Structure formats: C-alpha cells, structure tokens
Amino acid sequence: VNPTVFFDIAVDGEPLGRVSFELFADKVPKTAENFRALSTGEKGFGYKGSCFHRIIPGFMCQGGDFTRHNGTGGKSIYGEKFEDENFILKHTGPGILSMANAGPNTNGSQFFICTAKTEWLDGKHVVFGKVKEGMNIVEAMERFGSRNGKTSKKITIADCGQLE
Amino acid sequence: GMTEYKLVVVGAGGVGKSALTIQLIQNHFVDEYDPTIEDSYRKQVVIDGETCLLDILDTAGQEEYSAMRDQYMRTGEGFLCVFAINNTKSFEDIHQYREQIKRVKDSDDVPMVLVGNKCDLAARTVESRQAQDLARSYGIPYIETSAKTRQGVEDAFYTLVREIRQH
Ligand SMILES: CCn1c(-c2cc(N3CCN(C4CC4)CC3)cnc2[C@H](C)OC)c2c3cc(ccc31)-c1csc(n1)C[C@H](NC(=O)[C@H]1[C@@H]3COC[C@@H]31)C(=O)N1CCC[C@H](N1)C(=O)OCC(C)(C)C2
Ligand SMILES: Nc1nc2c(ncn2[C@@H]2O[C@H](COP(=O)(O)OP(=O)(O)NP(=O)(O)O)[C@@H](O)[C@H]2O)c(=O)[nH]1
Ligand SMILES: [Mg+2]
Structure with missing residues (x-):
C-alpha cells in the first residue's frame, strides 16, 4: 500500500486548503520514503513551515527548501543529496509530483507539482507521486506565481504529515 | 533623461x-x-563622463531551452558572453551563444564582450591567451572577471556600454 501524505497550504498565513499525495513507494521506494519522512518531520526536520518559492503558471509549483528558505537549499533523509533512483515514471500531466535537482544525482528535498504535462523533464527528474485530493489547491497556488516563478504572496506548508 | 542600455548576460x-x-x-x-x-536589474552609472541607466537581463544557462533565448536576444542591445576560466566546456559553448545572437539579430556586428569569469580561482583550464585570441577573431573585447573579488566586474559591464555607444 503506497503511503499518502498531506500538506495544509496557507497564503500569507491564512488557510487555503489541503492537498494530498500518493507516493509511489512501489516504483521508487527510496524517493517516496524521503518525501514521506520529510512530511512527518520524524527525522527532526522537514517540510512543515517551508514555502513554495517558485510558482510558474502553466507549468509547476516548486518548494521544499526548508534549510535556507531561498530556493537553494533542502536536504534528504540520506544526506544532503541522493542519487536518481529511476526514471520509470513520466511527467504525464497536472498533479505529477517530481524531484527538483541541480543535475544528475542531486535529489535533496526540493520537489515540484506539475500543473501541465512537462514531457521534456522525463529522464531528468524522478517522478515519485501524484496529487490524490486537492488538485484545485495547487491550481489556486498558481494564482500567486509569475513568469520567472517569484511569488506574490508567501505560500507555505502550514502543516503536513501522513494520512492513515 | 539618461539613456538606458539593455544589456543581456548569457x-x-x-x-x-x-554572481x-x-x-x-x-x-x-x-x-x-x-x-x-530569468531576472532583470537596473543600475545608474557614470561611464566616460555620461550618466546612464543599465537595464541588465540575467539569463538562464539551461541547455534544454536554447530555443527560448531568441526572444531576449531580439530585444537586447549588447551581450556579455560569459565563460568560467576553470570550465573548458563553458569556453567551448561561447561559439554557440555568439552564433545564436548573430542569427537572431541577423547581424555580424552585435555589441558584445567576452568575459572570462572566476579569475580568482587557481586551477585555470582556459588560458588568457586562448580567450584573447578568440575575442580578437570576433572583433570584441575580452575581460577577465571575478564576481568574488570584484576584479573587472565594472570593467566588463562598462566596456559593453562603450561597445553599444560605438556601434
Ligand atoms: C527559458 C525559460 N525557462 C523555462 C521556460 C520554458 C518554456 N518552454 C516552452 C517550450 N516548451 C516546449 C514545448 C515543449 C518547453 C518549455 C516556456 N517558458 C519558460 C519560462 C516561463 O520563461 C521564463 C523553464 C526554465 C527552467 C529553468 C530556467 C529557465 C527556464 C531552470 C533553472 S533551474 C531549473 N530549471 C531546474 C530546477 N532546479 C532547481 O531549482 C535547483 C536549485 C538549486 O538546487 C536545488 C534547486 C528544478 O529542479 N526544477 C523542477 C522542474 C521545473 C524547473 N525547476 C523549472 O522551474 O522549470 C520552469 C519551466 C517554466 C517549467 C521551464
Ligand atoms: N570562486 C568563484 N566562484 C564564483 C564566481 N562567480 C560565480 N561563482 C560561483 O559559481 C556558482 C554559480 O554561480 P552563478 O552566478 O549562479 O552562475 P550562473 O551562470 O548565474 N548559473 P545559471 O546559468 O544556472 O543561472 C555559485 O556557487 C557562485 O558562488 C567567481 O568569480 N569566483
Ligand atoms: Mg544565474
């Protein structure tokens, strides 16, 4: 049974809503487990309180830098970065959850949620989950993005964790 | 009002x-x-006794999106073409940038400066002479810079303005 995690999203501190994700532990267990543990915070660090620093309408919402809160940071539960587990899954459309990176084998904690098909990222970013409920929250987050990704309001993961 | 110069860093x-x-x-x-x-910046400066406003477009170095550079090359007036002196591949990539600028602007004479950055670093793999020869073959200035120490930083941008003024 693939795990499910949730983010409660806030905009300038006010509740927006909950997005939940299925994590494809059956295909990318190491990558799924990293995101799961970062969502519960059980290693003593993780996504709670961090922001979506880059939102580009028509493409994706990107977040996960909980160490520097500036888009350059984040870390995995395995060390600062870990290798690309596999590229079996593709960026097939809205709702795909995939790892951000700085080149080959540089997965940390940053991730992105597609709001469109982004096929040119296949084979370069590890897809490891998908939005289960609350895709319209991700669509609503796009309202605060821009062409270069700078956000017009502070979009935060006010709470996060794992669902039964 | 002061003249504005649209500079593009590629x-x-x-x-x-x-940096x-x-x-x-x-x-x-x-x-x-x-x-x-993609980011844009503004700064007023004095170059050769004349105050001007630099509008600087800082572009992505992502090979996947090379076709998306045409739009900003069309609007830019002058180009810093930057490589790192410890990265031979980045030096070899200069030709493709210059050719794309020439093609997009349909001109063999586009204001442009060749910039060899990271000159504070010891393990150089691109010798100054190689880059000087390349710049000479393009007919453009070559300036070595360090964003870390500030060496040549003003010189690179101001020289590009001079190239625009003399175009
Ligand atoms: C050329 C402009 N331009 C575009 C782009 C492109 C396109 N077309 C149109 C044509 N289409 C063809 C029909 C198919 C292709 C795309 C249109 N309009 C645009 C934008 C809006 O014009 C401003 C992009 C894009 C992306 C980058 C740089 C420039 C870009 C870029 C820089 S860094 C990176 N990409 C990977 C990044 N790395 C880090 O953040 C590292 C930080 C440090 O270490 C951890 C952390 C990362 O993992 N992701 C996670 C994945 C999505 C990705 N960010 C991102 O933001 O993509 C943005 C975008 C818009 C999807 C692509
Ligand atoms: N030692 C040294 N490091 C430098 C210098 N310029 C940049 N760096 C370092 O090199 C890295 C990349 O710099 P950055 O300015 O982001 O490069 P970029 O060309 O803008 N990258 P991109 O094309 O992805 O936007 C950073 O770690 C930065 O600190 C320099 O002159 N000297
Ligand atoms: Mg840059």
Whole structure:
C-alpha cells in the first residue's frame, strides 16, 4: 500500500486548503520514503513551515527548501543529496509530483507539482507521486506565481504529515 | 533623461552570470547556487563622463531551452558572453551563444564582450591567451572577471556600454 501524505497550504498565513499525495513507494521506494519522512518531520526536520518559492503558471509549483528558505537549499533523509533512483515514471500531466535537482544525482528535498504535462523533464527528474485530493489547491497556488516563478504572496506548508 | 542600455548576460550554466550581475548591482558575492530562470536589474552609472541607466537581463544557462533565448536576444542591445576560466566546456559553448545572437539579430556586428569569469580561482583550464585570441577573431573585447573579488566586474559591464555607444 503506497503511503499518502498531506500538506495544509496557507497564503500569507491564512488557510487555503489541503492537498494530498500518493507516493509511489512501489516504483521508487527510496524517493517516496524521503518525501514521506520529510512530511512527518520524524527525522527532526522537514517540510512543515517551508514555502513554495517558485510558482510558474502553466507549468509547476516548486518548494521544499526548508534549510535556507531561498530556493537553494533542502536536504534528504540520506544526506544532503541522493542519487536518481529511476526514471520509470513520466511527467504525464497536472498533479505529477517530481524531484527538483541541480543535475544528475542531486535529489535533496526540493520537489515540484506539475500543473501541465512537462514531457521534456522525463529522464531528468524522478517522478515519485501524484496529487490524490486537492488538485484545485495547487491550481489556486498558481494564482500567486509569475513568469520567472517569484511569488506574490508567501505560500507555505502550514502543516503536513501522513494520512492513515 | 539618461539613456538606458539593455544589456543581456548569457553563457553556460554555473559560469557566474548571476554572481557578476549581483556583484555589480548589490555589492555582494552570492556564494550559493541559485540557478536562474530569468531576472532583470537596473543600475545608474557614470561611464566616460555620461550618466546612464543599465537595464541588465540575467539569463538562464539551461541547455534544454536554447530555443527560448531568441526572444531576449531580439530585444537586447549588447551581450556579455560569459565563460568560467576553470570550465573548458563553458569556453567551448561561447561559439554557440555568439552564433545564436548573430542569427537572431541577423547581424555580424552585435555589441558584445567576452568575459572570462572566476579569475580568482587557481586551477585555470582556459588560458588568457586562448580567450584573447578568440575575442580578437570576433572583433570584441575580452575581460577577465571575478564576481568574488570584484576584479573587472565594472570593467566588463562598462566596456559593453562603450561597445553599444560605438556601434
Ligand atoms: C527559458 C525559460 N525557462 C523555462 C521556460 C520554458 C518554456 N518552454 C516552452 C517550450 N516548451 C516546449 C514545448 C515543449 C518547453 C518549455 C516556456 N517558458 C519558460 C519560462 C516561463 O520563461 C521564463 C523553464 C526554465 C527552467 C529553468 C530556467 C529557465 C527556464 C531552470 C533553472 S533551474 C531549473 N530549471 C531546474 C530546477 N532546479 C532547481 O531549482 C535547483 C536549485 C538549486 O538546487 C536545488 C534547486 C528544478 O529542479 N526544477 C523542477 C522542474 C521545473 C524547473 N525547476 C523549472 O522551474 O522549470 C520552469 C519551466 C517554466 C517549467 C521551464
Ligand atoms: N570562486 C568563484 N566562484 C564564483 C564566481 N562567480 C560565480 N561563482 C560561483 O559559481 C556558482 C554559480 O554561480 P552563478 O552566478 O549562479 O552562475 P550562473 O551562470 O548565474 N548559473 P545559471 O546559468 O544556472 O543561472 C555559485 O556557487 C557562485 O558562488 C567567481 O568569480 N569566483
Ligand atoms: Mg544565474
């Protein structure tokens, strides 16, 4: 049974809503487990309180830098970065959850949620989950993005964790 | 009103385009790696006795999106073509940038400066002579810079303005 995690999203501190994700532990267990543990915070660090620093309408919402809160940071539960587990899954459309990176084998904690098909990222970013409920929250987050990704309001993961 | 110059900083990923620009604008060396999507900056400066306004476009060094560069090459007036002196591939990538600029602007005579960045670093793999020869073959200036120490940073941007003024 693939795990499910949730983010409660806030905009300038006010509740927006909950997005939940299925994590494809059956295909990318190491990558799924990293995101799961970062969502519960059980290693003593993780996504709670961090922001979506880059939102580009028509493409994706990107977040996960909980160490520097500036888009350059984040870390995995395995060390600062870990290798690309596999590229079996593709960026097939809205709702795909995939790892951000700085080149080959540089997965940390940053991730992105597609709001469109982004096929040119296949084979370069590890897809490891998908939005289960609350895709319209991700669509609503796009309202605060821009062409270069700078956000017009502070979009935060006010709470996060794992669902039964 | 002061004249505005539309400068565009191009070159392979990681060569220090953003570090150079932020050093010029903000007097700060960015140590972290924040790969750029696209950013714009403004700064007024005095060059050869005349105040002017630099509009600087800091571009992405992402090879995947090479076709998306046409739009900003059309609007830019002058180009810093940046490589890093410890990255031979970034130096080899210069030809493709210059050719794209020439093609997009349909001109063999586009204001442009060749910039060899990271000159503070010891393990150089591109000798100054190689880059000087390349710049000579293009008919453009070559300036070595360090966004870390500020060496040549003002010189690179101001020289590009001079190239525009003399075009
Ligand atoms: C050329 C402009 N331009 C575009 C783009 C492109 C396109 N077309 C149109 C044509 N289409 C063809 C029909 C198919 C292709 C795309 C249109 N309009 C645009 C934008 C809006 O014009 C401003 C992009 C894009 C992306 C980058 C740089 C420039 C870009 C870029 C820089 S860094 C990176 N990409 C990877 C990044 N790395 C880090 O953040 C590292 C930080 C440090 O270490 C951890 C952390 C990362 O993992 N992701 C996670 C994945 C999505 C990705 N960011 C991102 O933001 O993509 C943005 C975008 C818009 C999807 C692509
Ligand atoms: N030692 C040294 N490091 C530099 C210099 N310029 C940039 N760097 C470092 O090199 C890395 C990449 O710099 P950055 O300015 O982001 O390069 P970029 O060309 O803008 N990258 P991108 O194309 O992805 O936007 C950073 O770690 C930065 O600190 C320099 O002159 N000297
Ligand atoms: Mg940059």
